[PDB]
């Protein structure tokens, strides 16, 4: 029979797409339903050839190809809301490629995905990917420290945070990572206690820490 | 410093640790005597130090 009947009763969670190299690709949408389909190909109730694709798995397979055939490329993410036409979020402020070498990039990427009909490459801005992350980190009233440097920013959330801001920060970073990917802007959640625990120090350009009523320590300038 | 240093025994109970560097110690002694809290005096043969 057909593959759509070989899967579960709900014929809505899988999407079977026909490939161009006489293969038959199955498109799941999370990791739990991928092993559901991988069990089908493992018990062996299908004679022909088939494969199971994903979105996060498919994005780290043609990023290995993009590591050796196109180094120094500033991209963001490949979106698979329609797997016959993926969207390629390419950077705007850090490239110099024209349309012709963008065309030969779409052809070698078309030959990597035999199931897609045409890949669309759209250039996204780079200062709006961080202005929405900065605006989203201020909405939750979270302490942070921005560190601007060339080719990516970094937000450092240190200090002893409590339990209602751990859930509220983790629900925003994992939903920012879902749509933008973690290759340009990196979130560093780090829960640590009070440095210089019950100690009295003297900050700024000539620093010393007092470990006792009669003991002065002179480490690096606090 | 080319002179001996005599610190009294009430100011010898405090402690210190670190990496210090002496090349002009007459300015370095003056700055650390306000941070530690100390008084000193050089009479021409020795340097007396109190708390």
């Amino acid at each position: 029979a057909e593959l759509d009947s070989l899967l579960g009763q709900e014929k809505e969670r899988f999407q079977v797409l026909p490939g161009r190299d006489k293969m038959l690709y199955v498109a799941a949408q999370n990791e739990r339903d991928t092993l559901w389909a991988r069990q089908v190909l493992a018990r062996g109730d299908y004679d022909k050839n088939a494969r199971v694709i994903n979105e996060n798995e498919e994005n780290k397979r043609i990023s290995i190809w993009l590591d050796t055939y196109y180094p120094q490329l500033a991209y963001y993410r490949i979106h698979f809301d329609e797997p016959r036409k993926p969207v390629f979020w390419l950077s705007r402020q850090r490239n110099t490629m024209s349309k012709k070498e963008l065309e030969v990039l779409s052809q070698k990427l078309r030959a990597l995905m035999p199931y897609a009909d045409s890949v669309n490459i759209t250039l996204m801005d780079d200062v709006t990917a961080a202005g929405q992350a900065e605006a989203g980190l201020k909405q939750q009233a979270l302490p942070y420290s921005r560190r601007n440097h060339k080719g990516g920013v970094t937000f450092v959330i240190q200090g002893a945070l409590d339990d209602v801001e751990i859930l509220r920060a983790r629900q925003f970073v994992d939903s920012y990572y879902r749509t933008w990917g973690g290759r340009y802007v990196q979130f560093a959640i780090e829960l640590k206690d009070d440095w210089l625990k019950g100690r009295s120090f003297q900050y700024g350009a000539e620093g010393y820490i007092k470990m006792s009523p009669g003991h002065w320590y002179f480490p690096s300038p606090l | 410093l080319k002179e001996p240093v005599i610190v009294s025994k009430m100011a010898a109970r405090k402690k210190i640790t670190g990496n210090f560097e002496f090349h002009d110690p007459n300015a370095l002694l003056e700055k650390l005597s306000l941070q530690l809290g100390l008084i000193w005096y050089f009479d021409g043969q020795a340097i007396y130090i109190y708390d």
Binding site: S200, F201, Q202, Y203, K210, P213 | Q35, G37
Partner: peptide, 21 residues
């Protein structure tokens, strides 16, 4: 700028911290 973060000091170590300015 400069300053002092005192956590339960004992009024000897406070006025000694002001003994530099």
């Amino acid at each position: 700028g400069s300053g002092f973060v005192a956590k339960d000091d004992s009024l000897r170590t406070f006025f000694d911290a002001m003994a530099l300015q």
